[PDB]
Design a binder for this molecule. Structure first.
Ligand SMILES: CC(C)C[C@H](NC(=O)[C@H](Cc1ccccc1)NC(=O)c1cnccn1)B(O)O
Ligand SMILES: CC(C)C[C@H](NC(=O)[C@H](Cc1ccccc1)NC(=O)c1cnccn1)B(O)O
Lengths: 233, 250, 196, 222, 244, 243, 204, 244
């Protein structure tokens, strides 16, 4: 069975599965946990950064795409660099040609279509990364989940990576509370840090261990690391 | 999309055989017998019209094709493979010869071109060799009358007489007994008809048998008059009636 | 050249002179400038003989391919194909073309395509070197919903005036009648139209 | 150059003069302006000599391949279409001006093609610098329903108009007759009304007249 | 031997293309979607499985418009469907550009068809992992189509695909029999809502969300529009009541 | 070794399995068709089977109008059929543009057989699992039937039949032509020739047809067209007033 | 400006009784300045002779090109190219450069080895074939050559007579052309032998 | 995809040999033997025609000996069709050289080029190599008479005497024994015929089973002549040497 049908992305299994895509999905699960959630005014990303040694840096998980849009990554970091870069260009093209900030929904559809092309052609490979995209556009705050299969979903909240199921159940439980946490950035982040701590096991979330991002109403997408995340530990 | 078969499909096996060329020749062996005989004043090529239905009109499928006014072809093996080789042979006779010296190529050179097209199918990426052997007969001013065999490998050899396909070994033997260097064209047509009767199972008449010659110029077949140096093609397909006439003196 | 197409009650008529010139020499005096691109879609050609023919041949090809896949094309679709060729190749073409067609749902329709490759849908249209001379006459004499006989007469008189003044126009007046009935070829010789 | 084409009741006839010029100079007193596209489609050419020979041979070749491919006799409308589309592609730069005529399985045909790629149909046509002399004759003597013989006369007369009145034309008359049921007949130097009169003197030199400096045998063999 | 099912363009000894048949499996594994043709238009509806409370309601739109007059819905690999619709949109733009008129639905059907069939001609590509239900109104009425991973498509009175295709097909067949005189736009919408609720039983474990769109000559002028608010809620009720 | 059965290269026996399996695919649809020549027409009959009640019967067809004069019936899966139909249309339109006359039936046939031959030789292309029957009244050869298969083979027919029950029809027709001694049906009108074809479809298959079980294409001088359900019924009524 | 008038140069060919003759001048100039008096414009491939007038660089190039093609021809055909055939090879080779032509006036002379029939032909720069039965002329003194030939020539001359004729035709045409002369060479081609003679002429 | 069916014609074996070259060489070893012998006043090429029949026209035939130049010729062992592809490019290269420098191509330059073309098929492009071995016989004004050999690897070497094709080892041993540097062409002719006569896998060595050629400075010229022996000429010279 499986061994005969997982050679490349161009091959269907007898049950209609695409194993190379499923294998790409496994790189996400092995990635460090990251969380996203939003109110009607703001959207927040929280990520647990991973290090190699205690002598190593913690590898960055949050990339900015435009002044109103950015993302967190779980999986193969280079693939996130390629995809965030493409998104950066699309965000950019919309501004130059149309003097228009790209709709987060529209960015969603673009990433879906780009990933898809690599799931149907020979010699290509699926992307091995999951992405959480937050933004503030003409219809307010937004959060998106991107899967290397091409599936993009709009959500109030979610988490991806190792042990991500913890935070996901927390957010599902908290839903009615955080959706209302309007006009107060520090409280939405607090709910996000509380979500991400439901996925801790190994160690605690430290000062150079945390990464948080925020966008909204009158707040351009900004990255917080180190000392600047201290008031959330 | 895009042909990503940029590698040879014919390669050498440890014994040194080229598998696909062998297998193509095997396909040729299953094909209906065809033959050629070279007389002093002409060449004859013949084969059997092995119709695939009595509902089919066997005239709509010619196995003997004109390549230039002085050159004709016949084959044994895969019919469709032959058809496209005829299209290509006819074209290359123009692009590589007529459009350059204002005359049609001599037989050996047109053969040489066909052979190259077949050699390439043996080496290029993503193709299989042609599943045919051809017999090409023709005339030219400086070489006179001449018969050639072309095989799936792209090799060709000149013949006094030969046969290919199904009953070739028997027919080749029958030609070795009957051939001499003093044969008039009519005599050769006679030998051809005898040789082919051993191969044909069913009916043996001008409707079943397809036969063509390279003989004298046919000014009646030219279509126009007024240029002395255009004296008419030497290639002539014999009619059903012309065959039956010679089957009564058989 | 003098060419026109007129919509009336039953359909549409196409008219043309028969003169092609190289300078002041009449290279052809019996030219057919009324060209068929489909059973009931025709065009009037003016400008370069080579350009208009090559354009007309391309359109006929496209519409035949259209019919094989989709069924009878609308006159508007025919005009669109013409336009696309004339517009996209405006720098290397000298083609002034009138498209007229009969359709059962739109009766008779006329589309004019002048030099730059713009499209204009009109009740009637005139074009060619000779047309300049009948802008006044045609504007004063055209009515909507005329009868066949009336329309034949309008084109006949109009083109004879154009033929009279324009050296690039002349020969015979040709017409093509497009209705539900059918396609009818009309021809009128100098001895008739000159004395109108 | 003067080339004409004339339809008759059962076919078509074409004819041409035999003069070629560069500036005021007659380069060729007897070139052949009649070309065979296929055995029953012939072509009269005017303009640039290399160009009419080339365009005629190219389409001839391709027509031949089409015929073999389709098992059909070539049609005049095919040669017409292929020539016009070729000339059109070269915007005029290929200086071929052609009267194309022939018989095929749809009847008899007569067309003209100009260098930019426009085609015309007529019962009678002429092209070349002699075009106006010849057309004047055609416009004067043509009628519908000509016999083969009346057509040859009409065509041949048209070229004579060109030969005598146009400095661009001269020497001889070539004709080709294409009749619906028959083989095309090509009739090279049908008229030769311009035979040079006998010279007044022979200019044959006494041997040794020319001074030679040096001599040697040339090797032709290998 | 075997291995006939490992490469896309390969014929098995019985003349089948197993890779396509395998694509069909991914389709059968998908959400159920449907189309109903009515007296002057077409209605599309689909089941959206609510994986979580966290999925923002009404947001993750599945029905897709092509040009102004064509609706498309599909079951199977969602991205594969978007790819097909992307192509359909290019396919239609090209047609409108040259011919000025908007693309007829039969014409558009073949555009998709030929494209999908192209992905069964080479081993360097994979067949499409969706069946697509699409249609609209043109010069001569309403048209409804369904297109399979093989590139096969036909016109349909009613059509269904995905998990609950059998329930839906059974429900569709009854309508054809109890209404030979031709359904109306408004009725076909209520009916659409019902049919999805009834194929939802084949997956009754996970909640779901209803999505409906329509293209009717009298109701939408010919244009493809989404069913929203009052008309959606009215359709939901009719189905919620006919489930009991 | 075992890959000689996956792409179109020779087997040790000199055979092309992928071509052979393509021939197998042609019968997937379980539909039979036949073609006969009249005095000045050509008729194609093909079974029409609409199993699902949900289908729009008017869109279920294996007959195609290639050009104003050429019709083509296909035995094989629809997506491959339509692929071949699209190509033939395009090839027919292009021929007319380039050569200034309508593409003959046999010439288009040769052209499609050539494309099919190519899939037989080049590895990256699969054969189309279809058989194509082309029909017209050729302006030179008169009524015409030419048929092409996935082997790239093609020939002209007096009459022909294609599908699972091909042989039944073939032998039926073969017997008629031994009897009649001529190479067409002696009938002046296309209406009677359609009737003859339906009659012999009934005898050879041993099945009766309603107006919705058949599909008919007729080719006359300068048109090829297909009959409506009601045009068929008129043909079915006429045969019954005799049996 | 005119690439046909930079280097200067004439070639002329005539038919006789079972013979042909081809002649050229020897000048290679650069406008008014004479550069070389040894520049031969006649070449031969087997028994087929070719003279080229015009732009010297193209004269040289075309010779090297025909040597190349006739060598290949002979290898494949296993026979020497014939005058008729070569004429066709020249034509198609020139027309191949239709819109970027070689600035030359080629001239072919020879006797068919199979038929004994004398053959000459001339070409324009784009390959149009002029196949005269009497004489062909080419170069910056072609007007003068046409005049000399049209008077001096008569049919069926014997090799020794034809020699005298063609030499006078060339010499007297050259002396009325500023860009032709500086020596002259004449080939008398018979089936069997080919004789080559350098003429004495004015060196100004 | 395609990768499945790729034989990978240009990889190394674990032992560092090229599979396809070796198998091509194996094919060459079954081909009619060809012999080249250089003398002081000329060169000899001889070759055994593999498989013959009464009906094979030998007068029109050529399968082993090809003229490349007026001064260079080759003997072929292997696939004739493959050889012709190579022979034709070799003729072109010679003419390109002649046009560039106005000198006939030195023998090695041509040989190196042909050998380079063969080498390429060994390192890139995923095609099978040419199943050909060449013996080159030529003269030039730098080195005089030369004899070279190239095979499917694209390696080439120079020899006083050599053989290719079948039974080379036996033939090489025989040439090593009887060859002497002071040899004349006429003695070389005899050596080549003896050697072939002693290694045929046929009963006896008749004229109809041979092709013969000499490159001589034929002393009366003070220029080099390629003589391709006609069938009668072989029959004569076979009698003189004493084989009848
Ligand atoms: C459409 C064509 C056939 C009719 C007339 N065109 C020509 O006669 C044109 C010149 C012209 C004259 C007046 C205004 C514009 C262009 N003539 C040609 O195209 C022409 C003439 N001789 C040979 C080939 N083509 B016209 O539009 O006045
Ligand atoms: C078509 C040919 C055969 C007939 C006549 N043409 C010529 O004589 C043309 C006149 C011409 C045309 C364009 C540019 C320069 C010169 N002459 C030549 O083509 C020509 C050919 N070879 C040598 C010298 N001149 B004509 O149409 O008056």
């Amino acid at each position: 069975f499986r061994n005969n049908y997982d050679g490349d992305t161009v091959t269907f299994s007898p049950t209609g599965r695409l194993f190379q895509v499923e294998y790409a999905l496994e790189a996400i699960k092995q990635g460090s946990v990251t969380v996203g959630l939003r109110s009607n005014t703001h959207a927040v990303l929280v990520a647990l950064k991973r290090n190699a040694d205690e002598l190593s840096s913690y590898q960055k998980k949050i990339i900015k795409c435009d002044e109103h849009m950015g993302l967190s990554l779980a999986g193969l970091a280079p693939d996130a660099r390629v995809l965030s870069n493409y998104l950066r260009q699309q965000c950019n093209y919309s501004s130059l040609v149309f003097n228009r900030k790209l709709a987060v929904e529209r960015a969603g559809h673009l990433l879906c279509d780009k990933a898809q092309k690599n799931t149907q052609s020979y010699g290509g490979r699926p992307y091995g990364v999951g992405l959480l995209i937050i933004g503030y556009d003409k219809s307010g705050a937004h959060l998106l989940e991107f899967q290397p299969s091409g599936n993009v979903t709009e959500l109030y909240g979610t988490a991806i990576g190792a042990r991500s199921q913890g935070a996901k159940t927390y957010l599902e439980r908290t839903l009615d509370t955080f959706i209302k946490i309007d006009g107060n950035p520090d409280e939405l982040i607090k709910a996000g840090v509380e979500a991400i701590s439901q996925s801790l096991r190994d160690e605690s979330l430290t000062v150079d261990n945390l990464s948080i991002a925020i966008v909204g109403k009158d707040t351009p997408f900004t990255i917080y690391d180190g000392e600047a995340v201290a008031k959330y530990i | 999309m895009t042909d990503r078969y940029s590698f040879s499909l014919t390669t050498f096996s440890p014994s040194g055989k080229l598998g696909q060329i062998d297998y193509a020749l095997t396909a040729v062996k299953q094909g209906v017998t065809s033959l050629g005989i070279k007389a002093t004043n002409g060449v004859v090529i013949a084969t059997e019209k092995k119709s695939s239905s009595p509902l089919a009109m066997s005239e709509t499928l010619s196995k003997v094709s004109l390549l230039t006014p002085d050159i004709g072809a016949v084959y044994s093996g895969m019919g469709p493979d032959y058809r496209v080789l005829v299209d290509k042979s006819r074209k290359v006779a123009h692009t590589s010869y007529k459009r350059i010296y204002g005359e049609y190529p001599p037989t050996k050179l047109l053969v040489s071109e066909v052979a190259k097209i077949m050699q390439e199918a043996t080496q290029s990426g993503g193709v299989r060799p042609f599943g045919v052997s051809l017999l090409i007969a023709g005339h030219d001013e400086f070489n006179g009358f001449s018969l050639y065999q072309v095989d799936p490998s792209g090799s060709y050899f000149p013949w006094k007489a030969t046969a290919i396909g199904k009953g070739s070994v028997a027919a080749k033997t029958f030609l070795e007994k009957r051939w001499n260097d003093e044969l008039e064209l009519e005599d050769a047509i006679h030998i051809a008809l005898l040789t082919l009767k051993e191969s044909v199972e069913g009916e043996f008449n001008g409707d079943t048998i397809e036969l063509a010659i390279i003989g004298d110029e046919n000014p009646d077949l030219l279509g126009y008059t007024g240029i002395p140096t255009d004296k008419g093609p030497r290639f002539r397909k014999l009619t059903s009636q012309e065959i039956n006439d010679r089957l009564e003196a058989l | 050249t003098s060419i026109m197409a007129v919509t009336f009650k039953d359909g549409v008529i196409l008219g043309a002179d028969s003169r092609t010139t190289t300078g002041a020499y009449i290279a052809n005096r019996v030219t057919d400038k009324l060209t068929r691109v489909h059973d009931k879609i025709w065009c009037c050609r003016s400008g370069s003989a080579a350009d208009t023919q090559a354009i007309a041949d391309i359109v006929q090809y496209h519409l035949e391919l259209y019919t094989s896949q989709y069924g009878t094309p609308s006159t508007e679709t025919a005009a669109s194909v013409f336009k696309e060729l004339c517009y996209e190749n405006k720098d290397n073409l000298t083609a002034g073309i009138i498209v007229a067609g009969y359709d059962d749902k739109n009766k008779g329709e006329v589309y004019t395509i002048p030099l730059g490759g713009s499209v204009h849908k009109l009740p009637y249209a005139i074009a060619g070197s000779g047309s300049t001379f009948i802008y006044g006459y045609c504007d004063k004499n055209f009515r909507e919903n005329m009868s066949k006989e009336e329309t034949v007469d309008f084109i006949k008189h109009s083109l004879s005036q154009a033929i009279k003044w324009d050296g690039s126009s002349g020969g015979v007046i040709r017409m093509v009648v497009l209705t539900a009935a059918g396609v009818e070829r009309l021809i009128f010789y100098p001895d008739e139209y000159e004395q109108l | 150059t003067t080339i004409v084409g004339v339809k008759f009741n059962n076919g078509v006839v074409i004819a041409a003069d035999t003069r070629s010029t560069q500036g005021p100079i007659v380069a060729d007193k007897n070139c052949a302006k009649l070309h065979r596209i296929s055995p029953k489609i012939w072509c009269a050419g005017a303009g640039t000599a290399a160009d009419t020979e080339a365009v005629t041979q190219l389409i001839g070749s391709n027509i031949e391949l089409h015929s073999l491919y389709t098992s059909r006799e070539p049609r005049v409308v095919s040669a017409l279409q292929m020539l016009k589309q070729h000339l059109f592609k070269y915007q005029g730069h290929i200086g071929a001006y052609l009267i194309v005529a022939g018989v095929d399985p749809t009847g008899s045909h007569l067309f003209s093609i100009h260098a930019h790629g426009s085609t015309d149909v007529g019962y009678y046509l002429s092209l070349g610098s002699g075009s106006l002399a010849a057309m004047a004759v055609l416009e004067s003597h043509w009628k519908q329903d000509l016999t083969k013989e009346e057509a040859i006369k009409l065509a041949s007369d048209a070229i004579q108009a060109g030969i005598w009145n146009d400095l661009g034309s001269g020497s001889n008359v070539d004709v080709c007759v294409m009749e619906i049921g028959k083989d095309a007949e090509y009739l090279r130097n049908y008229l030769t009304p311009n035979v040079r009169e006998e010279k007044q003197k022979s200019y044959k030199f006494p041997r040794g007249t020319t001074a030679v400096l040096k001599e040697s045998i040339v090797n032709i063999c290998d | 031997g075997t291995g006939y099912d490992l490469s896309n363009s390969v014929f098995s000894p019985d003349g089948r293309n197993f890779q396509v048949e395998y694509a069909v499996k991914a389709v059968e594994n998908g959400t159920t979607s449907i189309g109903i043709k009515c007296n002057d238009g077409v209605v599309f509806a689909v089941e959206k499985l609510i994986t979580s409370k966290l999925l923002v309601p009404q947001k993750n739109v599945k029905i897709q418009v092509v040009d102004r007059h064509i609706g498309c819905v599909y079951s199977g690999l969602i991205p594969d469907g978007r790819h097909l619709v992307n192509r359909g949109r290019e396919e239609a733009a090209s047609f409108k550009k040259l011919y000025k008129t908007p693309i007829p639905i039969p014409a558009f059907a073949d555009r998709l068809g030929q494209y999908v069939q192209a992905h069964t001609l080479y081993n360097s590509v994979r067949p499409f992992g969706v069946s697509t239900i699409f249609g609209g109104v043109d010069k001569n009425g309403a048209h409804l189509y369904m297109l399979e991973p093989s590139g096969s498509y036909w016109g349909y009175k009613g059509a269904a695909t995905g998990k609950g295709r059998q329930s839906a097909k059974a429900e569709l067949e009854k309508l054809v029999d109890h209404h030979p005189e031709g359904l109306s736009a408004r009725e076909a919408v209520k009916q659409a809502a019902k049919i999805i609720y009834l194929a939802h039983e084949d997956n009754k474990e996970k909640d779901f969300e209803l999505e409906i769109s329509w293209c009717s000559l009298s109701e939408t002028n010919g244009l493809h529009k989404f069913v929203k608010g009052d008309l959606l809620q009215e359709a939901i009720d009719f189905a919620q009541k006919e489930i009991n | 070794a075992g890959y000689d059965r996956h792409i179109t290269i020779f087997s040790p026996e000199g055979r092309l399995y992928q071509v052979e399996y393509a021939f197998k695919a042609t019968n997937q649809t379980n539909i039979n068709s036949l073609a006969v020549r009249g005095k000045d027409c050509t008729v194609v009959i093909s079974q029409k089977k609409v199993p699902d009640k949900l289908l729009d019967p008017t869109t279920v067809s294996y007959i195609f109008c290639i050009s104003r004069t050429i019709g083509m019936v296909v035995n094989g899966p629809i997506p491959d059929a339509r692929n071949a139909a699209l190509r033939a249309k395009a090839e027919a339109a292009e021929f007319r543009y380039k050569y200034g006359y309508d593409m003959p039936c046999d010439v288009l046939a040769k052209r499609m057989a050539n494309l099919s031959q190519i899939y037989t030789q080049r590895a990256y292309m699969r054969p189309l699992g279809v058989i194509l029957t082309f029909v017209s009244v050729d302006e030179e050869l008169g009524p015409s039937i030419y048929k092409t298969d996935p082997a790239g083979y093609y020939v002209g027919y007096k009459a022909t039949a294609t599908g699972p029950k091909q042989q039944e029809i073939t032998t039926n027709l073969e017997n008629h032509f031994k009897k009649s001694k001529i190479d067409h049906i002696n009938e002046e009108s296309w209406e009677k020739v359609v009737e003859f074809a339906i009659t012999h479809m009934i005898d050879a298959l041993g099945t009766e047809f309603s107006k919705n079980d058949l599909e008919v294409g007729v080719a006359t001088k300068d048109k090829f067209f297909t009959l409506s359900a009601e045009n068929i019924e008129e043909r079915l009524v006429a045969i019954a007033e005799q049996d | 400006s005119d690439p046909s008038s930079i280097n200067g140069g004439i070639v002329v060919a005539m038919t006789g009784k079972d013979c042909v003759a081809i002649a050229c001048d020897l000048r290679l100039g650069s406008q008014s300045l004479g550069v070389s008096n040894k520049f031969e414009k006649i070449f031969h491939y087997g028994h087929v002779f070719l003279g080229i007038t015009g732009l010297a660089t193209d004269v040289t190039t075309l010779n090297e090109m025909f040597r190349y093609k006739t060598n290949l021809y002979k290898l494949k055909e296993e026979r020497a190219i014939e005058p008729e055939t070569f004429t066709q090879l020249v034509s198609s080779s020139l027309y191949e450069r239709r819109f970027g032509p070689y600035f030359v006036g080629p001239v072919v002379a020879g006797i068919n080895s199979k038929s004994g029939k004398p053959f000459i032909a001339g070409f324009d720069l784009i390959g149009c074939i002029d196949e005269a039965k009497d004489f062909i002329v080419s170069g910056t003194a072609s007007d003068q050559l046409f005049g000399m030939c049209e008077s001096l020539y008569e049919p069926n001359l014997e090799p020794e007579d034809l020699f005298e004729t063609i030499s006078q035709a060339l010499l007297n045409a050259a002396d009325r052309d500023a860009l032709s002369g500086w020596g002259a060479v004449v080939y008398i081609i018979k089936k069997d032998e080919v004789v080559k003679r350098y003429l004495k002429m004015r060196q100004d | 995809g395609s990768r499945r069916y790729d034989s990978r014609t240009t990889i190394f074996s674990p032992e560092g040999r090229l599979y396809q070259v070796e198998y091509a060489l194996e094919s060459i070893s079954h081909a009619g033997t060809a012999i080249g012998i250089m003398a002081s006043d000329g060169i000899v090429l001889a070759a055994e025609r593999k498989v013959t029949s009464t009906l094979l026209e030998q007068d029109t035939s050529t399968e082993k000996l090809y003229k490349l130049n007026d001064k260079i010729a080759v003997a072929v062992a292997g696939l004739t069709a493959d050889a012709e592809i190579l022979i034709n490019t070799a003729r072109i290269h010679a003419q390109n050289y002649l046009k560039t420098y106005n000198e006939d191509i030195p023998v090695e330059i041509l040989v190196r080029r042909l050998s380079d073309i063969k080498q390429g098929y060994t390192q890139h492009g995923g095609l099978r190599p040419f199943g050909v071995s060449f013996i080159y016989a030529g003269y030039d004004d730098r080195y005089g008479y030369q004899l070279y050999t190239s095979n499917p690897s694209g390696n080439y070497t120079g020899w006083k005497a050599i053989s290719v094709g079948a039974n080379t080892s036996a033939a090489q041993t025989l040439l090593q024994m009887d060859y002497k540097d002071d040899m004349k062409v006429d003695d070389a002719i005899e050596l080549a015929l003896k050697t072939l006569s002693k290694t045929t896998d046929s009963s006896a060595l008749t004229y109809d089973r041979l092709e013969f050629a000499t490159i001589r400075k034929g002393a009366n010229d003070g220029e080099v002549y390629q003589k391709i022996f006609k069938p009668q000429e072989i029959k004569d010279i076979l009698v003189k040497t004493g084989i009848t």
